[PDB]
Assembly symmetry: D2
Homo-oligomer: 475 residues x 4
């Protein structure tokens, strides 16, 4: 029973009122712990402290900021089981991958620290541009922005927090961290590790509380020099709308399509599709959520997908099931309504439409069409629609008609064609003969259209949290 406190200027404190928010395991209903519900004034307190501390943190030598990240990473890898079991219970993530998230987070932090140590500067002579004549040399370097607001999702309460926090701190920014409420105990345990590593006072502040007590206030605060957000599209749009005069990075929803051509390896395709679509029960922005399959191979493809779906284990997070309960009641009803609309409008159900409360069985729908909601709306749940298609050009048209633009998969033996087709897809990343995915973490990661704003991935993140400082000398 973790009745967690929050971190402000180096000490672990409670809200002044004493008010708290209750957290329970999605799979069980069982009381897990509580977090402080913070007021606007304590938000102000945390931000001011981070600004203050940023002035002493930026001036530290890079290798010192690098060593804190490495010590923090080591402690997470040390506490892999403990933190892992808390993620499992807190967001109903299957055991091994709750542990796997913590391992990967320590890997992301280390790589980020090492990358920061290799942000070389550059020098430019004045006469490299016509009319500049050569007496002056510019020293270009990178400078932190100040105070980074980092907002993480329930999805990956450790990974997608640390993926933000680590580049901000290592480049000499300070961080105000606002975890998703569900995922906040997990997030707090991650930060406890940072504090135990010796994070100086104020370098990282944790802020918890309801979406409408402190949300806009945080986003509109003149002390915030940068926002990175992962989460729902709606919230992200609102954040963009309300934010003023600062860089903002957004990673939002996805409706990633897998395009399947008739020359495809249909056994590889089915495997990658089922893997990418049903991971963490479909609760992921980056995941295959749409299949566009050419007519001639559809029947064999579907029959392959049906077989693997029916092997997936349904049950408890603790039992390491493939398909675990969804995050809450409200989510379950949403996926349900999508399933309903499909079947009403004449979809073939090949597998599923079964549940016990939040625990939904894996659902496979065939003969899905554009008239169906499940063809566009991100379910964030374990449902996969198949849309039969005439050729590549129809797959592209429907793919691009999505408000979404995160990732796309293209399955085909002909790699040259796949490349050409990918160029016509409005997505951040196209995967050839492979499921969509965020990592490996050094690759650029980004959504366009309503799937995001800015760029993440290890090095792009470092860049987004800094700016050019030019020094001009006369030689």
């Amino acid at each position: 029973q973790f009745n967690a406190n929050i971190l402000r200027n180096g000490e672990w404190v409670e809200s002044r009122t004493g008010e708290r928010i209750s957290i329970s395991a999605p799979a069980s209903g069982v009381a897990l712990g509580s977090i402080p519900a913070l007021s606007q004034e304590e938000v102000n307190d945390a931000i001011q402290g981070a600004k203050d501390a940023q002035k002493i943190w930026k001036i530290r030598p890079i290798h010192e900021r690098v060593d804190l990240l490495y010590a923090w990473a080591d402690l997470l890898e040390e506490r892999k089981e403990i933190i892992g079991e808390l993620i499992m219970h807190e967001v109903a993530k299957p055991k091994k991958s709750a542990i796997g998230e913590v391992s990967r987070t320590a890997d992301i932090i280390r790589h980020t620290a090492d990358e920061a140590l290799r942000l070389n500067g550059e020098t430019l002579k004045g006469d490299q541009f016509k009319g500049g004549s050569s007496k002056k040399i510019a020293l270009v370097e990178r400078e932190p922005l100040g105070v980074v607001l980092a907002i993480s999702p329930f999805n990956y309460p450790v990974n997608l927090a640390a993926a933000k926090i680590a580049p901000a701190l290592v480049t000499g920014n300070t961080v105000v961290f606002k975890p998703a409420t569900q995922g906040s105990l997990s997030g707090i345990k991650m930060v406890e590790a940072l504090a135990d590593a010796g994070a100086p006072e104020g370098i990282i502040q944790v802020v918890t509380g309801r979406g409408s007590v402190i949300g806009d206030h945080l986003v509109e605060h003149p002390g915030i020099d940068m926002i990175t957000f992962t989460g729902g599209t709606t919230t992200g749009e609102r954040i963009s709308e309300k934010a003023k005069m600062i860089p903002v990075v957004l990673e939002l929803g996805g409706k990633d399509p897998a395009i399947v051509l008739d020359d495809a390896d249909l056994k590889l395709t089915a495997s990658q599709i089922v893997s990418g679509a049903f991971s963490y029960s479909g609760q992921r922005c980056t995941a295959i959520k749409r299949v566009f399959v050419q007519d001639s191979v559809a029947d064999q493809l579907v029959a392959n997908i049906k077989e693997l779906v029916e092997q997936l284990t349904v049950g408890s997070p603790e039992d390491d099931a493939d398909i675990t309960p969804v995050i809450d009641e409200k989510s379950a009803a949403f996926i349900q309504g999508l399933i309903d609309d499909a079947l009403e409008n004449g979809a073939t159900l090949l597998s599923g439409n079964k549940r016990q409360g939040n625990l939904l069985s894996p659902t496979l729908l065939d003969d899905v069409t554009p008239a169906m909601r499940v063809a566009w709306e991100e379910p964030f749940g374990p449902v996969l629609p198949i849309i039969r298609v005439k050729d590549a050009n129809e797959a592209i048209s429907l793919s691009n008609q999505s408000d979404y633009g995160l990732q796309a998969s293209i399955f085909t033996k002909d790699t040259d064609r796949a490349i050409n087709i990918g160029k016509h897809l409005e997505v951040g990343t196209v995967h050839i003969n492979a499921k969509t995915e965020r990592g490996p973490d050094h690759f650029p990661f980004l959504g366009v259209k309503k799937s995001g704003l800015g760029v993440q991935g290890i090095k792009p993140s470092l860049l987004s949290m800094t700016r050019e400082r030019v020094t001009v000398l006369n030689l």
Copy 2:
């Protein structure tokens, strides 16, 4: 005179509203031309044509996009006398500097084309990260954002129009171009060259009209995928507040300080200061606008500066005077409040606080204090305040107190000292023993705090108007 049309979908037209906005020459108050006053509906057409044309434009091989920039620049350079004369008249820019603007524009266009040509992609192996597959390979390239809204100011109505347009187009975007109303005719003439150079239909659209009609409408339009703005801080902040879900780039106002220490070369310093401050009669975002001088050398530096300020010729743009008339009545009056507020508070007038209409003499003010408006407020006029300072630590503080953070200058024999002082100034670019300035145009250019957002210069312009496209190949 020049009753201009605007470009939409490769055709030159006037407004369906039947309305025009009259443009006058600021030096004479005589009519020069006019532009269409478009409707929000004409803005939609422009934006829609731009989006359609982008789908075709973006598929063009790079060398073809690069070849259009070259054709454009050659025609510009070729018409430099004609366009220069129109700038000169439209914005009261000294004759040789207006022609020089076009020269610089043609150069900026070519360098941008040159740089876009040498944009290489990158490959990354999985397992360049622990413990990625190996034989998974990402190919990363730059992809255009879509439709770029470029908004330019009156003071460089070609240079700062083309600096936005050339990187957008060459990287595969299309552009909706909104010039400052004053400077519109110069902007249209620059676009004519681009059209004569053979720009395909819809890749560049020109929008003109009343702020109350089209301003917020452009910045809030869902078909705009990026905004790049140069202009006043207040407008910039408003653009930022109102836009959503897209990148925004802003170069805004500045109040560049020049810190002059005990050991400075006071002749080079005076010279650099006056050149930087009074260029185009101070109507520049990047310009020394504040002098913090160690009181020890203050009397000497002020006698050097006064000499050079009285050296500046004052007169008409056609005569190539150093000081020409300010952009308008409103501007002249604003500068006047600043000067008057300073004297009213006991600052010392060293050189002319005199006017004829909107042509003001260059004004030097000594004994300025943190209590006077002109200590902080960007005049956009020919006035220079001098503030006496205890030491390097007082100038650093007074510098940083400003809302602005564009550039600064440090004048001292002690390079080592200047570098560490520069470190403590919240600015984009610190110049040692030289004036502030935007170029050379390959240097990164940026303001921090209220001075800007995002970054400019040739290569950072190219980055700002694109995004990573990743294609991951499976080789297993």
Copy 3:
């Protein structure tokens, strides 16, 4: 006749010894002109001259050195027709291909100019390394090595002369330029254009003469700080063995294989192969010289190849014949030998074992084996051997069994497999579904094993012409 002089310290002179070497056209035997045969002491004069001029040239601002290159490129382009006719005559190169050499040379010169202008330095903080810790900053810029000896081949007397001179000069070096005797008139005309454009005195020095008199002397000279050479492997090894304490760049012989798999478009394959193998009658280091074709498609491919080879126009340079006379008497007899050896051991002559003095019929040999010389030795003439092979695996082994490692081509619709096969071939560049080639000239160009040393191409060449200069500040 064009009785050329050479350049030294700004003036065009003949040799003090009064001697000269005659140059006649390889196609018609007509006297074209002559060059001075310099002494070792005139060579010393050239190098001392270049040395002194460099101290002065290196201190020019970069923008002035690019402008010289621009003026030179503009002059060569204006002289396309004139310099182009000399080349076709001097080295029996087809008229359109000879004029194209000049156009391309100008492009190379400008692109090399443009790229030198945007070479920027880097800065490094001491704290980017454990320890370091502070206000130590390294300013890493680039410095010219000194005097460059550029040695060019017969086959591209202007292209491959200027591709060495242009990057050396632009980066602050001076050049001692040694053209092939056969190709020297064309070389010297390219230099006339440099000098007419305002090249400072001693910046560019031309040396001509007998190999037995000047060759080893040039290569072993203490005043030479860098050598770049293109020519035969044997001569190249002698350079490498004899030079000392200096960077040496070599591009030597090739035996580029074309590997043709089962699934290849045999029409596109035949066309790429013939075009590459028989361009300039095979007198090219980069050129398909071996075909390894899988048994199943060999009949068809060899039919496709035969058809295209018989279409080849064979005759005069002025007539833009596909196949024109090979460089000299030695060359043609050596090629006859290779053809002769193959025939005497069981190879099948598909097309053209016809000789007309130095004018050689394109020769296509089928059923070639490992026991035949022509499977291995570079002919530098219009002969192509087809080797029939079991599979990819056998193709790779026979490819790598060559002493040469220049380039290779892979023909297959399986792009993924082609890439993987490419990784197992020991060559600089692998071309998938296209012929081997040096250009486009921004592409790095290099051979490994006996094919070469170091790297060429626009940027790699610039790099090879300079070294790092570090300045470390301590604040």
Copy 4:
């Protein structure tokens, strides 16, 4: 008490021919152990093993190549004290500095590993060059060269050995390792840690032997695709001369000048000068070995320098003396002759000529002239000349007259001028207001003129270990 074996093909073996070479502490003459003196065959055998393992190693996922480095670094750090102690005895290096060599070594190996992870490829399009094809794409990557011959000095027998081996293996080359014979025990112990870290068989081979029975044969071997060498200039020369058709990287001798102008902080200068010149008794390629000092300030600086020099302790490596014995008899004899000639040509002895066998007092000479050998010849010993100069201009000239060109120092409060001056100096690196040094190791390191060939430091090392690998694809043009 260390009769060491060599590594070939995963097994720690001995010479079949059975011969060894005994190694002795230079400070003592007391035995330390022996190394095997190898034959021409056992040397080919090592080269072949490396070539066969090259084809297995090079295709290992890059992350697997870096994990081996990390592991090796950890084990070295762990064996700080054991390895460090061997170094202080074997090459007579002050105790804490020898352990420091092992610490820094693991630091170089880790940073090299991470740097390899970041060697990204590039793509070029055909139409980036006039007339080029828009449907051509070149994928450019880096490929190992093959088997790399690493030849390290007595100088730094762990540090300058690993600085060559690490970048080589992590970029997918294999190594034939030849330590300086004096230093071979420390290098063997270094290699042991790599083996115990899990190095696959063949990737690293250790070749030991006299230095002629193996010397030329190695450098001339067609099985070698790259040479990297640190040592004497004369040896470097021979290698460049005798090798053909491969890249050759050389780190050779220096005569780094210290330039001291009128407006200099003479306390900091004096301290930087002494720390750098006399570090490891002057047995460093990178070290101040010449002071050009302006006349108006000469007396005061040379007064300061005298003081710090008399503060230097003299004795054995175990005691952590500043000045320990020089490597051998030959070297000390040669150093003595440089002092003699200088005194013989009338140089003022400012302090400590004194020498008892191997151990030499730090020696300070003043009024040193261009006619004296010690103004030019790298002594590799605890001797430092002062050259009284008129200006920077004379300092620049006399500086550039040396055949050497490694590094240099300028001392001044006038930073811009120092930057100007440094530019006329024919060296790889100029240090402003600080001593010359190789580090920090991410900094590019090179000697020009007779001081070397090619470039080192962490990244530049990786590039010298590889070559471009280009794959050109045809981009499909349309569909639709």
